[PDB]
Design a protein around this ligand. Structure first.
Ligand SMILES: [Mg+2]
Ligand SMILES: [Mg+2]
Ligand SMILES: [Mg+2]
Ligand SMILES: [Mg+2]
Ligand SMILES: [Mg+2]
Ligand SMILES: [Mg+2]
Ligand SMILES: [Mg+2]
Ligand SMILES: [Mg+2]
Ligand SMILES: [Mg+2]
Ligand SMILES: [Mg+2]
Ligand SMILES: [Mg+2]
Ligand SMILES: [Mg+2]
Ligand SMILES: [Mg+2]
Ligand SMILES: [Mg+2]
Ligand SMILES: [Mg+2]
Ligand SMILES: [Mg+2]
Ligand SMILES: [Mg+2]
Ligand SMILES: [Mg+2]
Ligand SMILES: [Mg+2]
Ligand SMILES: [Mg+2]
Ligand SMILES: [Mg+2]
Ligand SMILES: [Zn+2]
Lengths: 8, 94, 38, 129, 140, 134, 136
RNA sequence: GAUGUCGGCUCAUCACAUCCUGGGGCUGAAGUAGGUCCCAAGGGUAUGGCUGUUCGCCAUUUAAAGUGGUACGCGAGCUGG
RNA sequence: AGCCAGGAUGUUGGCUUAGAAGCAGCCAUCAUUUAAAGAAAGCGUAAUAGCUCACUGGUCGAGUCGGCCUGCGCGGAAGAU
């Protein structure tokens, strides 16, 4: 959960 | 080799020795051998400077009283408990 | 300025000066080093 | 370490022995010459048989007393570098002339040949020999 | 693994070995073995040292040379660890590994340090374990 | 007055010297061929300190310097790693015979006219790197 | 927390700290911290001085603690009246007389020993001095 | 052979270990806004909901809603929860 | 004491580290020129760089520095009529 690139 | 000038004590006791220390002098004793133990008073500052040398205690020293040289070694030393002072020193002849 | 009972030089530049009966440490290099006994 | 009186005496002895062996002594000022250059100066000195030693002026006067280089006592003003030539009297002057050309801050104050004090203009003549 | 025992987060990088067991002729069933496996998993996780993992991002920042000390210091202020530094004809590239929790509004602080002349890119790299203070914070 | 170290043969690629010559504003190709000339004559793959005194009006003067004593002694000992503890542990041993050739190589750098004094400067470096000296 | 492992009696009379000290010489090592005054050293104060002194020398050399807290001090609970027996033991203290050597050190340079004893002294309520061994 | 005991109200007075306003040093003080000390007592320094409450919490302000001493100031001034 | 000048070379010692170049740390603390220069006492740098210091040659002219013991002072030191 934490930025436009998706990811945690 | 340390030549230490000293005078025979006029009197002896806690009061006499405490008064001597208040005068910047300290009681000391020369004992051993046939000669009777002689009570002497030494200047505190003079001996305090000499005894800073480690060799002083081990090497023989000369003490002159009434112009007579006596060769002795420092048997025991009494130091003030907290202050950098010498309460008393014991000397053994030869 | 640090107002503390124990004032002392924290660097060579620090200087102990008594002004008007008050011990002060002034430092040319650091402002934080400035101190006053009080 | 403030040199001890004996330490200065050993210096005075060494310098006096070097001065007794030296055909020429050149006094110059190394004020403002960097170590990078000074080390190159000495490297050139060693190659040319010139022992270059900077000494305290007072020690130099103490050593000069009793050698043919008595005239140098006045020459000892400011920082004084003494370049004793052991092998060739002209080599020391030639090295200083090259250094002085490379370094406009290098002032060669005075020179001495055979007892006679030499002026700065005649130092160039000592280099031509 | 879908719901971790401690904090409910997904279990990762963990393997198990089934070496022994028991059965009944009538009672034993697929569902029964699944529930027994669940009980054993919880007991083992409770005794194994369970640590939460924080996602780490590979971050590359292009900064003017004058502010490189400031950007490197900001990344160090974050629990991020520098892994690289490339000087470039235009700007200086800085590579660092920073937890995403620390990477919030990083652009605002980065622009304040470099006069808005610095840009950064990031990619998820791995799940290194969180520091204890941050991990306890996550558990709460 | 710019100081940089470029390995022999690494002059040809633009990127290692690209930031240094881009910020100053110097053409890489001209420096490249010139530095390559000397580096190709010297053993390739050996790091070379270069003092490149660039004047403002596009004038470049580079001073090639002998490879550092660290790499020379490390290669002479044939070890790619130094010593973590110079005294309590020894990484490798070097020969006195091997101190003379590198001393002759770097004699142009120091100021002691004594070759034995130069072999001492290297053996002292060997003590710092933990190399045993006979 | 230095404290007798066992004792004959658990409570002791308050007593009087009078007289000069015994153990005034640096016997165990080269340097020592010597009390110039009289007072009581708590186990906690001794532990804090030991922690600060051992941290300074970077765990080098050897540290001798020449003083042991063998005296049980009893304090009454707050808001209780006088009497109703003696108070429960709370802490242990060592009686100090002027001249006592509290700590000794060896294997470290003298200039380093001076600083380590300065950091230890700060945590101590008794004026202390730096002493070195002497040949009697 | 009696010094009325909590809170409120009316009326205060002082201290300063200063809440605001005034002056200043350092700041991890760009500015705005702070933090922390030093100096300073001239003046100012809420209204209500709940509860007997002091207090506290809450709503809404305000430059700010100081902390204490005064027989926990004040019942031959009032009240009596 | 001040002032002038140098304060280096091997070298950016090895290790480590994203980097660690005298100056985070860790170990070694050597050798050269030599007036003297620490594998560095500081400031500084992301590392560099840069600025000092130790040390040294000049200038200058007479005392100067650091501890020990001790007398009497100073700061620490804010309350309510
Ligand atoms: Mg009596
Ligand atoms: Mg004033
Ligand atoms: Mg009555
Ligand atoms: Mg005030
Ligand atoms: Mg006021
Ligand atoms: Mg007032
Ligand atoms: Mg007025
Ligand atoms: Mg109501
Ligand atoms: Mg009041
Ligand atoms: Mg009031
Ligand atoms: Mg009261
Ligand atoms: Mg009342
Ligand atoms: Mg009344
Ligand atoms: Mg009345
Ligand atoms: Mg009435
Ligand atoms: Mg190094
Ligand atoms: Mg290092
Ligand atoms: Mg550094
Ligand atoms: Mg003169
Ligand atoms: Mg004179
Ligand atoms: Mg006083
Ligand atoms: Zn300062």
């Amino acid at each position: 959960x934490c930025w436009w690139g998706x990811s945690g | 080799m340390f030549t230490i000038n000293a005078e025979v004590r006029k009197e002896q006791g806690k009061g006499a020795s405490r008064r001597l220390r208040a005068a910047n002098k300290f009681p000391a004793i020369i004992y051993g051998g046939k000669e009777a133990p002689l009570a002497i008073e030494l200047d505190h500052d003079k001996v305090m400077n000499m005894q800073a040398k480690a060799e002083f205690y081990s090497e023989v020293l000369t003490i002159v009283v009434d112009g007579k040289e006596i060769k002795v070694k420092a048997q025991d030393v009494q130091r003030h408990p907290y202050k950098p002072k010498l309460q008393h020193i014991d000397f053994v002849r030869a | 300025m640090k107002v503390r009972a124990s004032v002392k030089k924290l660097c060579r530049n620090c200087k102990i000066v008594k002004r008007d009966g008050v011990i002060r440490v002034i430092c040319s290099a650091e402002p934080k080093h400035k101190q006053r006994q009080g | 370490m403030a040199l001890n009186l004996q330490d200065k005496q050993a210096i005075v002895a060494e310098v006096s022995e070097v001065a007794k062996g030296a055909l020429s002594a050149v006094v110059a000022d190394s004020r403002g010459v960097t170590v990078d250059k000074m080390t190159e100066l000495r490297k050139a000195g060693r190659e040319a048989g010139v022992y270059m030693r900077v000494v305290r002026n007072t020690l130099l006067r103490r050593a000069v007393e009793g050698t043919p280089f008595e005239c140098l006592k006045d020459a000892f003003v400011g920082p004084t570098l003494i370049a004793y030539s052991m092998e060739h009297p002209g080599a020391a002057a030639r090295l200083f002339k090259e250094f002085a050309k490379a370094n406009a801050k290098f002032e060669v104050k005075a020179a001495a040949f055979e007892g006679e004090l030499i002026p700065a203009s005649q130092i160039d003549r000592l280099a031509t020999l | 693994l879908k719901a971790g025992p401690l904090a409910g987060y997904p279990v990762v990088d963990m393997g198990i070995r089934l070496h022994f067991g028991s059965y009944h002729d009538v009672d034993s069933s697929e569902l029964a073995f699944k529930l027994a496996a669940s009980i054993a998993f919880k007991e083992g996780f409770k005794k194994a040292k369970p640590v939460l993992l924080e996602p780490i991002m590979k971050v590359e920042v292009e900064t003017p040379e004058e502010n490189t000390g400031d950007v490197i210091g900001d990344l160090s202020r974050r629990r991020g660890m520098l892994k690289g530094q490339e000087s470039e004809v235009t700007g200086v590239k800085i590579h660092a590994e920073v937890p995403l929790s620390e990477m919030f509004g990083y652009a605002t602080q980065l622009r304040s340090l470099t006069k808005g002349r610095a840009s950064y890119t990031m990619e998820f790299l791995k799940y290194d374990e969180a520091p204890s203070n941050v991990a306890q914070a996550v558990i709460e | 007055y710019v100081k940089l170290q470029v390995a022999a043969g690494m002059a040809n690629p633009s990127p290692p010297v690209g930031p240094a010559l881009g910020q100053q504003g110097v053409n890489i190709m001209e420096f490249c061929k010139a530095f390559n000339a000397k580096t190709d004559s010297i053993e390739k793959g050996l790091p070379i300190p270069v003092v490149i005194t660039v004047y403002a009006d596009r004038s470049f003067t580079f001073v090639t310097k002998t490879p550092p004593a660290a790499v020379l002694l490390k290669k002479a000992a044939g070890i790619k790693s130094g010593s973590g503890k110079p005294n309590k542990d020894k990484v490798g041993k070097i020969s006195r015979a091997q101190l003379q050739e590198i001393a002759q190589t770097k004699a142009a750098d120091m100021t002691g006219a004594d070759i034995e004094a130069m072999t001492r400067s290297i053996e002292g470096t060997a003590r710092s790197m933990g190399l045993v000296v006979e | 927390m230095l404290q007798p492992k066992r004792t004959k009696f658990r409570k002791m009379h308050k007593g009087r700290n009078r007289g000069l000290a015994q153990g005034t010489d640096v016997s165990f090592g080269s340097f020592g911290l010597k009390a110039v005054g009289r007072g009581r050293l708590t186990a906690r104060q001794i532990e804090a001085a030991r922690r600060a002194m051992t941290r300074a020398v970077k765990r080098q050399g050897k540290i001798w603690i020449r003083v042991f807290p063998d005296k049980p001090i009893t304090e009454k609970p707050l808001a209780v009246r006088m009497g109703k027996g003696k108070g429960n033991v709370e802490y242990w203290v060592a009686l100090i007389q002027p001249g006592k050597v509290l700590y000794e050190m060896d294997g470290v340079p003298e200039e380093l020993a001076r600083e380590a004893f300065k950091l230890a002294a700060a945590k101590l309520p008794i004026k202390t001095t730096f002493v070195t061994k002497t040949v009697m």
